[PDB]
């Protein structure tokens, strides 16, 4: 009873090739093993040579990166085929359970394919760090070879009347499409860089921004997966432990984020709009359209990541519901009904109903969310920071203005400096919280929808309690900001008085007038202390609300469902899926008030900036 | 979340002014950059080198340059990858030829005494290292086995020749 590739039932009758060499359902799996192990045994010597070269003599310490055409879509196809290969492994482990011994022909090909995909992106990266695309022939034959072999497997399944009921048919069909859509990528590289069958290769030089000697913020010129997890930051962070961070140790920022480059882009938007449209002034709405047209191509991308991250965030409570539902019912059967040619096919419903499989899927879903959410954050921040540079340059351009008593007597240099600092910072902070207004409504809507499905009308009562904490937080935060305004505009006078009564220390000390002026300052300090007491009250209500809205909602939720409703008796699956949903919904509900305030202040800031940017100029 | 969203407002009335820099001494930080170390080891870090594959095209200069432990790894992996690759081929041709299923007395297997993948892997060891323990022959039943035998012998001799040259 040893480890056999096709099992050991019916006296090894699974190995008979009498009817057909390629009609033996275990032989097609054996064929699919070949292209993956072929890549491993042709690339491992190459990879170890590369690793040795890095160790013994890493001559190109700052080697430039040349990314081949079709490089972002290359990585995303690898990511989604890694997903399906994990699912194939899960199906194989789940189907072999109903046999006398482990079959090994359900999850050996998928396991070696999983390792082959990982090694085929490591090999591709090592052939992208140093521009040498002739070694990519090994990858083109590999992809097409795999596409051939499982195509044979796919057509055999359709002959034997498998259909879309069996999960592995769907997985194999989808995976075959993946291999075709990535073989096309490889031939795209052939077509562009013209290295294999064309007369003269069309070489490309690395972008000039990376060619600059001092550029440490090399975020754009990085492979997609190190953009997700910020792997390039590791070396920089390690260096910061030994040597400090000097202003000459920080990078010279790339061309894409230069102030003048963003200023030129913003000027292009302004000029194109003001020419194609007969709107004579460049007023508030003109600037609003200009910002959208100039930075929309990145703002939309951030929103897409945020929406995907939100939809994947709701896969934690839902998977918990599935896991704990399966975890009861005494596990009476746990058997695969479908039988085909002595092998069992786990149905789709039988797949997402298991516990270990759902837990592995939950882990993978979290890996996507935690990275999409951070990727969405970075795109929003980078667009906001580029906005700050362009807007600051634009403001300073109009400063180059007439010094009339009408203009200079209305907005003094203090006003314009405050305009620069305050308005642009809170306009930038609007572009940070900008994907929220597109996503957070979807988050709340979809959260309430699927929370109703899990529990019922009592969940809507609890959702009402939480959704009744955005207006409460809004009023408290407005009161908090008003109290802070009063306290801060009072300490300004105190600080000016203290500076005035401490600059002349010698004069006051000589006349024995040090303590008297100290008490004159302490009086204003006591007044500011009363104001700060109001500020402390209004900030303690916010701490209370933040840390007691979810708990009060939970109490109302469950008490209503048991006492008032009595519809369905509580279960651990329902009662913890709903509780987990409450945490994931409390996080954005509180911050929604700050998003609204930021949007309001953004409108007022652009009103300020448009009353300035269209003032009286100097001359022609 | 101390300042996750509440850091947007700016006072713009801060009292911050000039302060002592307390910069570290430049003499201690600055050290004479030696062109070459006391014993060779030229300390001239290169930068911005454009890579056109020149460093990986001359694989034999690279192989000799590498340290012995890395050469041992490449030595071992080259042999073991070829051994495993041809083991897969030998196992799969046997399982395709249907000779490890029947056990029938009249059928003549194309590779005698193939019973599993361990036997196929041992047969791959014997062919490429040229040991030939005799218990796993090649019969005349399928000409594909003869072609694979030719390919395996030629590949093994090429690999041995290249590794011999690098070692010398």
């Amino acid at each position: 009873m040893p480890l056999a590739f096709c099992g050991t039932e019916n006296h090894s009758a699974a190995y008979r090739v009498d009817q057909g060499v390629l009609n033996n359902g275990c032989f097609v799996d054996a064929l699919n093993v070949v292209p993956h192990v072929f890549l491993l045994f042709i690339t491992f010597p190459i990879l170890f040579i590369g690793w040795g070269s890095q160790s013994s003599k890493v001559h190109i310490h700052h080697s430039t990166w040349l990314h081949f055409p079709g490089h972002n879509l290359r990585w995303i196809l690898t990511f989604i085929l890694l997903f399906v290969l994990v699912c194939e492994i899960a199906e194989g482990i789940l189907s072999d359970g109903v046999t006398e011994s482990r079959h090994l022909h359900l999850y050996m090909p998928a396991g070696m394919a999983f390792m082959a995909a990982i090694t085929s992106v490591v090999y591709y990266h090592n052939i992208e760090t140093s521009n040498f695309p002739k070694l990519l022939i090994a990858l083109l034959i590999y992809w097409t070879l795999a596409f051939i072999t499982k195509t044979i497997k796919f057509v055999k399944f359709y002959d034997h009347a498998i259909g879309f009921s069996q999960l592995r048919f769907c997985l194999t069909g989808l995976l075959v499409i993946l291999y075709g859509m990535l073989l096309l990528v490889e031939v795209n590289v052939i077509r562009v860089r013209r290295y294999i069958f064309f007369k003269t290769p069309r070489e490309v030089k690395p972008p000039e921004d990376l060619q600059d000697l001092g550029v440490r913020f090399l975020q754009p010129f990085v492979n997609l997966l190190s953009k997700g997890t910020y792997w390039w930051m590791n070396a920089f962070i390690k260096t910061a432990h030994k040597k400090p961070i000097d202003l000459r140790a920080i990078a010279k920022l790339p061309i894409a984020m230069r102030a003048l480059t963003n200023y030129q882009r913003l000027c292009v938007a302004f000029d194109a709009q003001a020419r194609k449209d007969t709107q004579s002034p460049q007023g508030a709405r003109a600037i609003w359209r200009a910002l959208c047209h100039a930075f929309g191509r990145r703002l939309i991308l951030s929103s897409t990541f945020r929406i995907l991250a939100d939809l994947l965030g709701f896969a934690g409570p839902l998977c918990i519901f599935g896991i704990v539902d399966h975890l009861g019912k005494e596990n009476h059967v746990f058997q695969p009904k479908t039988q085909f040619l002595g092998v069992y096919f786990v149905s789709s419903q039988e797949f997402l109903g298991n516990a270990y499989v759902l837990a592995v899927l939950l882990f993978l879903a979290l890996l996507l969310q935690r990275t999409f959410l951070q990727a969405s954050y970075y795109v929003a921040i980078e667009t906001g920071i580029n906005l700050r540079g362009a807007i600051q340059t634009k403001i300073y351009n109009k400063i180059m203005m007439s010094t009339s008593n009408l203009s200079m007597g209305e907005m003094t240099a203090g006003q314009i400096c405050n305009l620069v600092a305050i308005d642009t910072n809170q306009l930038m902070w609007f572009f940070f919280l900008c994907p929220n207004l597109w996503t957070m409504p979807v988050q709340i809507i979809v959260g309430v929808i699927l929370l109703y499905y899990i529990l019922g009308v009592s969940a809507l009562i609890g959702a009402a309690v939480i959704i009744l904490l955005a207006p409460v937080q809004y009023f408290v935060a407005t009161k908090l900001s008003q109290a802070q305004r009063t306290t801060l505009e009072h300490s300004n006078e105190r600080l000016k008085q203290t500076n005035e009564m401490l600059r002349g220390m010698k004069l006051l000390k000589l006349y024995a007038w040090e303590s008297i002026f100290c008490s004159r300052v302490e009086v204003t300090r006591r007044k500011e202390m009363t104001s700060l007491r109001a500020f402390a009250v209004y900030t303690s209500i916010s701490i209370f609300m933040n840390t007691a809205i979810p708990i009060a909602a939970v109490l109302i939720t469950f008490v209503g469902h048991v006492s008032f409703f009595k519809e369905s008796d509580l279960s651990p699956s329902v009662a913890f899926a709903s509780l987990s949903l409450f945490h994931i919904l409390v996080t954005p509900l509180f911050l929604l008030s700050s998003v609204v305030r930021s949007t309001v202040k953004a409108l007022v800031s652009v009103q300020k900036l448009s009353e300035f940017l269209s003032s009286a100029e100097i001359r022609e | 979340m101390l300042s996750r969203k509440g850091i947007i407002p700016e006072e713009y009335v801060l009292t911050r002014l000039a302060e002592d820099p307390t910069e570290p001494r430049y003499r201690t930080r600055e050290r004479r950059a030696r062109f070459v170390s006391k014993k060779g080891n030229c300390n001239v870090a290169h930068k911005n080198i454009r890579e056109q594959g020149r460093f990986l095209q001359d694989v034999f200069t690279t192989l000799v340059d590498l340290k012995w432990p890395h050469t041992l790894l490449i030595f071992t992996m080259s042999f073991l990858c070829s051994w495993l690759l041809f083991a897969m081929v030998w196992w799969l041709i046997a399982f395709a030829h249907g000779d490890l299923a029947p056990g029938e007395g009249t059928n003549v297997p194309c590779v005698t005494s193939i019973h599993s993948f361990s036997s196929a892997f041992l047969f791959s060891i014997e062919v490429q290292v040229t040991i030939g323990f005799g218990g796993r022959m090649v019969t005349e039943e399928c000409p594909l086995a003869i072609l694979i035998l030719i390919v395996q012998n030629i590949v093994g001799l090429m690999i041995n020749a290249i590794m011999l040259g690098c070692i010398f």
């Binding site: 030994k242 040597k243 400090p244 | 570290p24 201690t28 930080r29």
Partner: peptide
Amino acid sequence: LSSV
């Protein structure tokens, strides 16, 4: 150094 002293900074470290």
